[PDB]
Subunit: 307 residues, 4 copies
Amino acid sequence: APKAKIVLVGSGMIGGVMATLIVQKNLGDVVLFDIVKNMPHGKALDTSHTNVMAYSNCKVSGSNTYDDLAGADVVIVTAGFTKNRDDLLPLNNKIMIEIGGHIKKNCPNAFIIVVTNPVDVMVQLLHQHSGVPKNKIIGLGGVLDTSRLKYYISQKLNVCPRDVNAHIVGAHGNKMVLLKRYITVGGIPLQEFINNKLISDAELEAIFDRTVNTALEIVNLHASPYVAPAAAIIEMAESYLKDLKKVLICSTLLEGQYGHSDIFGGTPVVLGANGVEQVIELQLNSEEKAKFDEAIAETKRMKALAH
Amino acid sequence: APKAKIVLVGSGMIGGVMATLIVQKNLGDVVLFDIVKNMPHGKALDTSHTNVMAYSNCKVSGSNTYDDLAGADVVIVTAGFTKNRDDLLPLNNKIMIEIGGHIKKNCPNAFIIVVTNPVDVMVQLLHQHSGVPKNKIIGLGGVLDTSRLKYYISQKLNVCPRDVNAHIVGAHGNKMVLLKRYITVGGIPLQEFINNKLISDAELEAIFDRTVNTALEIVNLHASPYVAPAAAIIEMAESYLKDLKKVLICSTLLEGQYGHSDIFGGTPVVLGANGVEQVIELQLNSEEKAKFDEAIAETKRMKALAH
Amino acid sequence: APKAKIVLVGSGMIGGVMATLIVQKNLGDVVLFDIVKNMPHGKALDTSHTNVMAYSNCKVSGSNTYDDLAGADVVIVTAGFTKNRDDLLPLNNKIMIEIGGHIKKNCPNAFIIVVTNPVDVMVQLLHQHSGVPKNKIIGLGGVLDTSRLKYYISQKLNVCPRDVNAHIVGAHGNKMVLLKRYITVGGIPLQEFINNKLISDAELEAIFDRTVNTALEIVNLHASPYVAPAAAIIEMAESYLKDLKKVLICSTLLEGQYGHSDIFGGTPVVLGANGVEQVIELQLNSEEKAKFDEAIAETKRMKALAH
Amino acid sequence: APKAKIVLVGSGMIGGVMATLIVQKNLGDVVLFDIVKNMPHGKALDTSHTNVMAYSNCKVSGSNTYDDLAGADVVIVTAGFTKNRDDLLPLNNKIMIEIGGHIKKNCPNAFIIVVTNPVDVMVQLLHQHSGVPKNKIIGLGGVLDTSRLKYYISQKLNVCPRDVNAHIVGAHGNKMVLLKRYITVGGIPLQEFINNKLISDAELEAIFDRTVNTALEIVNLHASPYVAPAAAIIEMAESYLKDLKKVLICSTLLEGQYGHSDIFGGTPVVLGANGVEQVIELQLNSEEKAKFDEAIAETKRMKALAH
Ligand SMILES: O=S(=O)(O)c1ccc2cc(S(=O)(=O)O)ccc2c1
Ligand SMILES: O=S(=O)(O)c1ccc2cc(S(=O)(=O)O)ccc2c1
Ligand SMILES: O=S(=O)(O)c1ccc2cc(S(=O)(=O)O)ccc2c1
Ligand SMILES: O=S(=O)(O)c1ccc2cc(S(=O)(=O)O)ccc2c1
């Protein structure tokens, strides 16, 4: 059908919330692909029954066959080793290479979202091996990182979480650049709320640290982050599929923005029917740019080790 | 039932989209009240059948009896003469008085939203005659006025309409204060988009004029505005009912904000389970404040004629 | 964009709720077309601002130009004289002819939904003059008529309205065939609820009469039916657009079902990406079929007068 | 807040999709309670960030303290040993006893949904130890079991999954009673589709076996069922919270229906603001009743071993 076909390359925990949310939102047919035998068929089966509860009609099928990438409109890549961090780099590069090959053969016109960490590295590797246009591949980062910052501020301020807006750029991971100057509450600069003593500078510094360290905080609580990563990816995928043209911070190919080329980094983009319709370059000051540069340098360091 | 009871005092065009949207959103039971015999029963009947299409369960009933205000959780007032403008003032004051009396008797604990124009005048009159607390009554203005500004900018910029945020304050009507400095696009100050030549200052001045004159533009096109007014009111009502704590610009009692007391004017407020949970005072400069003052003066002029 | 283009040929009251609901549901871009100068531009403007409140991104534009049918994915026809009934027949035939011509020229691949009454007559006339395939054009009837029956029963039984299912076939209008034997409550035959004394046969006979006479009841209450007609049409259009494959009772071309050919009549169909994917023929008994025959005869009588 | 408080007693896989869906649907504040230290705080944190993506405002908090049951409006019990089956019975009885004690002390007015298997046994044990009224506690079964049957049929018939309705009664588990006679497609008896050769009797027998064995099929595919169980529970909880009055098949206290008293079994009930508002007794024939009796006997056998 002219229903979108959404192929989830990797059927782990992120894959399993993504499938669930696609059905809840009736976004398209789903393929849960994985290298593990049968498991994705089992998850797919479980998930398919929710069509009833949700009043939806999305097929959800499992796959242990790469050729099921054929005809995909959207491909979401979570496959990769997670278990030092740097030693995994060349192993995951191999995974990106193999997936990129299959994308180039089976669905060269697919919109691709990469999640595999370190995302700003893996997304470019997949970009290079899949051959897809620069506007048709992006990496998960800023939507997810900002959800934490937005949420933490909204709880202090007692407002709707979505009413806090905020920008985190450069890279996903420990070098993420939190931009205090670009935080708003109901469209109003956060500095007004600081001036008013509704939230203090010291509080915000604790929230910034908490934001950066959230994955680690969840892992030390003996859980792992996958629900919010999944919702963020679906917000991105949905903006493409429904041509919403939402402004969403994602890892995209830089061509001069922030003084950087030939690298992917986190910046606000507009996602619509044509993929990345606009790359928005924040007019950073020199102090913010210095931090952006550190993010890019780290991405470059890890990319060099990936080969 | 512990379903909310929502009483629409006035069952005209705004009333009829409001009832429709309450059912679409399953927000609560609806009473379409009006002084016109039977018409609200007819609209209510029509609307009730949509429960099937929407998978909802909201009763929708008509009423020609004020005592059906009893037990209302939310009351929305659109009743009033619309057909000079100033001569209608004392006539609509009489309507606010009569409604306020019935609210005080039948539902003193209701959250009240006033739409009747000029809203910043009528809302205070109803406040005074209903006896309800200052945090439990508000007027429609800024949500609706900003929807126009946000929408027009979003079309120029090719972004999701909701991703433009903007503030219009002071009053509804021709003295509305559009604050250029408080416009953002995906949380980013609009000035960046001006610096970048994505939108010009002259364009924005045309959009500001268009925003102010939108009711008149719709009326000269031989229609009348009621769909968006209705959606805006429901966004407000929904924030209260579901305790969303959205930041929404509404007419509320001023107690010193902007140098003004003992008057209602448009400002961002937070709407939650406790009504107006926060009144947010924008840190306006002297030039913006001068325009705010003109808005208040006009409200005061018309209020004096209402008595 | 690959957003659907939905053209509403007729921008009256039904047209105005349809546009509103398309935006609420983010279903596609909307054109409000009408022969009345400027009015559809005014309604379209009003409606467009709701994109903000709804978090949607659908263009809503007015049109006084038939060529704006070009590229329509879905066309919904409400245009026609409403103000005896039979004398309007040839006048509305002329309207169907003119619209069909423009559909054939501008959007031969559009899915068409006809509302203009008497719908079972007008839909076939449009079918003949537009040249579209039999699976790509349908008429509004059963979804709307059954909404009333389902709703009235659900109120007596104190259950979710959607949990009552029911079939009304043959034609829209006074000859509609209500099939008692095909009513269920939560999938359970209604006869069990009658056996149990939760609802009586005499009650159901009053509900059947009320269902048939609902348009007239609304009109005698000094309103007119347009909200539910609009929601029903959007349920149909949405099933096509999103390939839901809902079972919905609509006027469709009969090719032997119920002993009838070369005529449109109300029966359950399945609406998906391929239009009418299945025509379902209820296995009526001779008594039910006699009533079906009367419905068809009346449609035929009026069709003969249309030429 | 007058937001509902929903306490999930057990924060495993079912608990984690339930929390996610409550936020997606903005249904109320969530507590993920578990005996495992910190894990529910970690899941709760992850889940809380989705408020941003979903435009919701639900708190999601973890808890290792039973007294956080205080003020719960809805309590959902998934805690229990899963790893023969009968040997776990007295162990899980102990868990129901401990939970029931805390419910009686902290939230005697809560609506309770039990999931712990065997559900028809555990729900009655919790009923007895919590002291709550018979209309305020139910067990998960029929909504979930029928989702499978409805889904499998809808795929054969190429219709919207929700348009298949079906009844499975008696008990959850291997003795579930699938009632062929109560299956409909778009409200039309399934036998018509059999008469028409759209689906065969032998196909349906394979689908019935598949339905019964679905948990086992998922487990043999190296997954486990938790997504659909979660969606089904939320459909139930949502019907209560929003007073939808949906007809949903659940385990409830029998007081003579089907010839059975002093036992819980699966039957259609109506869930609204007053809990179980109606217990609906299907008018089973002697052959269907014999199978119902076997279901009850097995529940009774296991209940006897639980003490
Ligand atoms: O590249 S790493 O493996 O060190 C890495 C970086 C960022 C991450 C973010 C998350 S998040 O989903 O919590 O944003 C989870 C795991 C991560 C791993
Ligand atoms: O007070 S007036 O009658 O002049 C007045 C003011 C503002 C208005 C705004 C609208 S709007 O709904 O277009 O915002 C409609 C009618 C209005 C009438
Ligand atoms: O053909 S008539 O003009 O007599 C006719 C038939 C059925 C109708 C149904 C409705 S309904 O929207 O109430 O179903 C409204 C007007 C109608 C007019
Ligand atoms: O009581 S058992 O442990 O044998 C039992 C019964 C029914 C079940 C149903 C499911 S289901 O979630 O697949 O319906 C899962 C586990 C189950 C365990």
